[PDB]
Structure formats: C-alpha cells, structure tokens
C-alpha cells in the first residue's frame, strides 16, 4: 500500500536536496514535511524533495 504520484511537469531540481524528474514519471511518497514540498523516491531509488503542484496523486 505505497503512495505514488505522477509528474505533470519536468522538474530539473533547484536545490541539492531536490529530486529531479520528468513529465510522466512515477514517484513514491516517503515524507510530507510541508503542504507543498514532499520527500519522494523515483523508480531507481533516488530520494529527494519535490514540489506538489508539479505532480498529481497517482490513482
């Protein structure tokens, strides 16, 4: 019962802690320290922060 999101826009990543991704990517949600910034993990296991408005709740 993992929580995923689908990237709506390409995010190159602004900060070193940010998780860069591309439009259509599936990311697993690990943490929610903020309303608009969540800690996610991509398909390859790389972790980092992502902007919520750039993704949609998968399923």
């Amino acid at each position: 019962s993992a929580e995923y999101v689908r990237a709506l826009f390409d995010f190159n990543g602004n900060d070193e802690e940010d998780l860069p991704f591309k439009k259509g990517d599936i990311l697993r949600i690990r943490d929610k320290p903020e309303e608009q910034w969540w800690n996610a993990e991509d398909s390859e296991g790389k972790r980092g922060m992502i902007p919520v408005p750039y993704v949609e709740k998968y399923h």
Binding site: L8, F9, D10, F11, N14, E34, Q36, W37, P51, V52, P53, Y54
Partner: peptide, 10 residues
C-alpha cells in the same frame, strides 16, 4: 516557463 513557479519552501 510553461509550468507555474515552484511553491515557497517552508
């Protein structure tokens, strides 16, 4: 900038 700006951090 096709997407809107990223949200404010903290």
């Amino acid at each position: 900038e096709v997407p809107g700006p990223v949200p404010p951090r903290r």
